[PDB]
Write a protein that binds this ligand. Structure first.
Ligand SMILES: O=C(O)[C@@H]1CCC[C@H]1c1ccc2ncsc2c1
Length: 166
């Protein structure tokens, strides 16, 4: 495939210090993962950045999805358009520790990735979702069996994740 400059962590997990919006514009992957909430309200974090890069088309599509189907579950997902960034966007809901959600749901959230042969993704439940990113990377490698390319935006976080990976 066309992903370049990634560090191989395992047989199927790769990682790079990159902005997932810029990686998606360059690669045009079949699937880009969004770090969504149950309402698909893409205000901040990686969801806000991806939505802004679509000129708000992601949010307009998402509002129609919620009006028809109701909210997602924590640990769940839905497949929507990738707009100008990818063929599809897999919106995955990891638990948000800052909302008091159970971190135990993180493994269920990563299991959604196994439905897609290859994905470009951020770390679930990290950043403003409040979980320990070292734990999120461990759950990712121990749960996902398909090929995942993780784009870590924060440079200091990337360096910490590499140096502490077992
Ligand atoms: O990799 C990170 O530093 C965090 C961890 C969890 C969400 C990631 C994130 C956040 C915002 C953002 N904006 C553009 S790419 C991008 C990616």
């Amino acid at each position: 495939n066309s992903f370049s400059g990634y560090l191989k962590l395992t047989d199927n997990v790769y990682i790079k210090n990159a902005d997932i919006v810029e990686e998606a514009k360059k690669v045009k992957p079949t699937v880009v993962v969004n770090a969504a909430n149950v309402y698909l309200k893409h205000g901040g974090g990686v969801a806000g950045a991806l939505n802004k890069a679509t000129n708000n088309a992601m949010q307009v599509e998402s509002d129609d999805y919620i009006a028809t189907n109701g909210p997602l579950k924590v640990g769940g997902s839905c497949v929507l358009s990738g707009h100008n960034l990818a063929k599809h966007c897999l919106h995955v809901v990891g638990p948000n520790v800052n909302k008091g959600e159970d971190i135990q749901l993180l493994k269920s959230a990563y299991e959604n990735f196994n439905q897609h042969e290859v994905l470009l993704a951020p770390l679930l439940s990290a950043g403003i979702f409040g979980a320990d990113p070292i734990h999120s990377l461990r759950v990712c490698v121990d749960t996902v069996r398909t090929n995942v390319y993780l784009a870590v935006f924060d440079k200091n976080l990337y360096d910490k994740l590499v140096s502490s990976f077992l």
